[PDB]
Curated annotation (Swiss-Prot), chain A:
It comes from Homo sapiens. Transmembrane segments: none annotated. One of its GO terms (molecular function) is cyclin-dependent protein serine/threonine kinase regulator activity. The keyword Phosphoprotein applies. Interacts with the CDK1 and CDK2 protein kinases to form serine/threonine kinase holoenzyme complexes. Interacts with CDK1 (hyperphosphorylated form in G1 and underphosphorylated forms in S and G2). Interacts with CDK2; the interaction increases from G1 to G2. Interacts (associated with CDK2 but not with CDK1) with SCAPER; regulates the activity of CCNA2/CDK2 by transiently maintaining CCNA2 in the cytoplasm. Forms a ternary complex with CDK2 and CDKN1B; CDKN1B inhibits the kinase activity of CDK2 through conformational rearrangements. Interacts with INCA1. (Microbial infection) Interacts with human cytomegalovirus protein UL32. It comes from the Eukaryota. It is found in: Nucleus; Cytoplasm. This is Cyclin-A2.
Curated annotation (Swiss-Prot), chain B:
It catalyses: L-seryl-[protein] + ATP = O-phospho-L-seryl-[protein] + ADP + H(+); L-threonyl-[protein] + ATP = O-phospho-L-threonyl-[protein] + ADP + H(+). The modification N6-acetyllysine is found at K6. Pfam families: Pkinase. One of its GO terms (cellular component) is nucleus. Phosphorylated at Thr-160 by CDK7 in a CAK complex. Phosphorylation at Thr-160 promotes kinase activity, whereas phosphorylation at Tyr-15 by WEE1 reduces slightly kinase activity. Phosphorylated on Thr-14 and Tyr-15 during S and G2 phases before being dephosphorylated by CDC25A. The gene is CDK2. The record marks K9, K88, K89, L166 as: CDK7 binding. This is Cyclin-dependent kinase 2. Binds 2 Mg(2+) ions. Changing Y15F: 2-fold increase in activity. The modification Phosphotyrosine is found at Y15, Y19. Phosphorylation at Thr-14 or Tyr-15 inactivates the enzyme, while phosphorylation at Thr-160 activates it.
């Protein structure tokens, strides 16, 4: 707690300096939001298959969006960007990463070791080694302390909603990680407990319920539409009992804001 | 790399080798870490990935400045500010006379300032021991070697193979806690503080269990009153001998009451109750702190 406020302040500074270009997919000649959505969904599977943390997946996505913010990428190389990003994120966050051979194997050998490594080096150059990016998880972790009491279903559900925001560059690129986390948390807390974004967290973040509204409205819509959504790996992941079945919970029909 | 002149080898170090070098254009004296690639296979080592990405966010006078990273196809180089030597070599050289108390105080004060800054920037060092603490002739001391450092925006899990040497290892870890916390860094600083003071390692264990029992003989075997949870921890055995807390006047004779107080709080058993770097700096023991200059032999 001495340093907890300072961590939060600093993560707020840093999340602004690792923000992707919000408009980047429009300037990107051979790729789209839906190609991105596929890749990320696959990264979720890859993370499930190798038992990676959730933070690892959130970092990789941040890396990928920063790289595409300043590099043109053809379609057939997008997955190589994604793979190297996952590999990098593993080396940063995992206790020990899977081996490169695995990351080659998970591509159906559509690339080679040489290519994955050469891309690792490229992502590192393009991100200037700035790998320690704030994620919505880091912010949820911090918010979870303001529960009275802790409620493991609220936690699991916030993380689920958070993880959904990864998939859809429209609209989730326009929101900072701290704001997505703010919404995800309020929405989970309402769905599970019927409470709202608490006064303590307003004081901590400066974010009012008003401020989170655009993100909430979008997040709610995503939650409502999640089972029709084209990529499902996350809804799958979070029907498990690890996450208290929260992907099966029925969203409210209104938020009454 | 063409602008750098090898001066001399200064360590084999967290793989591969570390050279003193001179920039031929600016005259800046520098330390170089050479990583081969090779690697062996497997790309940029995880350890260098963390070291670079964390240490480049950590600009502070008590933290060894990372100056540059030169990334070839076939070789990777970290360039650091240069400092003449480590605390281990200096304690060693100071065996006969001892390190004067006011310089002990300066150093510990400085280490806590570096470490507070790490902690406020969500970095755990995890490998604080005297050879990873670097000093100069002007009387500064800096934290170095961030090979094992970790960001803790989300909790950091414990791992049998990536852990400080035994002597500076916190009791949490020896007892099998699942998460690291900032307190492990304070523990290590506590051990080092006492070592500067007494000239003797505080807990020099031959093994995990020996390390634990040495800790236990000095501070007493912890029980549930002192440290809620301790019995339920994975590597807690109820067969543990129940020793009693030695008199602190006898474990660090040279220290006054302020010094004993601070050390007691740095060696608190329960990680939540162990003093923080930030609170440590406000301890009365630093009331009168100064910045002496050591006598370095080199």
């Amino acid at each position: 707690p001495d340093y907890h406020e300072d961590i939060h302040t600093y993560l707020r500074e840093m999340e602004v300096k690792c923000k992707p270009k919000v408009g980047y997919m429009k300037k990107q000649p051979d790729i789209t939001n839906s190609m991105r959505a596929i890749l990320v969904d696959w990264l979720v599977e890859v993370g499930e298959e190798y038992k990676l943390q959730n933070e690892t997946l959130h970092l990789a996505v941040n890396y990928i969006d920063r790289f595409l913010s300043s590099m043109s990428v053809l379609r057939g190389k997008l997955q190589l960007v994604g793979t190297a990003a996952m590999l990098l994120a593993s080396k940063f966050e995992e206790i020990y990463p899977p081996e490169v051979a695995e990351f080659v194997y998970i591509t159906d050998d559509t690339y080679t070791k040489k290519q994955v490594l050469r891309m690792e080096h490229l992502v590192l150059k393009v991100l200037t080694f700035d790998l320690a990016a704030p994620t919505v998880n880091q912010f949820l972790t911090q918010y979870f302390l303001h529960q009275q009491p802790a409620n493991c279903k609220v936690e699991s559900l916030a993380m689920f909603l958070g993880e959904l925001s990864l998939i859809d560059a429209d609209p989730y690129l326009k929101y900072l990680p701290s704001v997505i986390a703010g919404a995800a948390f309020h929405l989970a807390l309402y769905t599970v407990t019927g409470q709202s974004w608490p006064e303590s967290l307003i004081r901590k973040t400066g974010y009012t319920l008003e401020s989170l509204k655009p993100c909430l409205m979008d997040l709610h819509q995503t939650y409502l539409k999640a089972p029709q959504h084209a990529q499902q790996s996350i809804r799958e992941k979070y029907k498990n009992s690890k996450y208290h079945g929260v992907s099966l919970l029925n969203p409210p029909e209104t938020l009454n804001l | 790399m063409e602008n750098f002149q090898k001066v001399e080898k200064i360590g084999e170090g967290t793989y591969g080798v570390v050279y003193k070098a001179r920039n031929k254009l600016t005259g800046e004296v520098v330390a170089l870490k050479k990583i081969r690639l090779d690697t062996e296979t497997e790309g940029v080592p995880s350890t260098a990935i963390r070291e670079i990405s964390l240490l480049k966010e950590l600009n502070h006078p008590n933290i060894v400045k990372l100056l540059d990273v030169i990334h070839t196809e076939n070789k990777l180089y970290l360039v650091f500010e240069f400092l003449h030597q480590d605390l281990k070599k200096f304690m060693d050289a100071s065996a006969l006379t001892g390190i004067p108390l006011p310089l002990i105080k300066s150093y510990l004060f400085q280490l806590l300032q570096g470490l507070a800054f790490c902690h406020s920037h969500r970095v755990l060092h995890r490998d604080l021991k005297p050879q990873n603490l670097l000093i100069n002739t002007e009387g500064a001391i800096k934290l170095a070697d961030f090979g094992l450092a970790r960001a803790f925006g989300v909790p950091v899990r414990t791992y049998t193979h990536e852990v400080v040497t035994l002597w500076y290892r916190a009791p949490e870890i020896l007892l099998g806690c699942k998460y690291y916390s900032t307190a492990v860094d304070i523990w290590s600083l506590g051990c080092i503080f006492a070592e500067m003071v007494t000239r003797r390692a505080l807990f020099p264990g031959d093994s995990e269990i020996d390390q634990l029992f040495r800790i236990f003989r000095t501070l007493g075997t912890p029980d549930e009153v002192v440290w809620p949870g301790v019995t339920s921890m994975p590597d807690y055995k109820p067969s543990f001998p129940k020793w009693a807390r030695q008199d602190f006047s006898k474990v660090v004779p040279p220290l006054d009451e302020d010094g004993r107080s601070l050390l007691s709080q740095m060696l608190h058993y329960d990680p939540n109750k162990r003093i923080s770097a930030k609170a440590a700096l406000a301890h009365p023991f630093f009331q009168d702190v100064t910045k002496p200059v050591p006598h370095l032999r080199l």
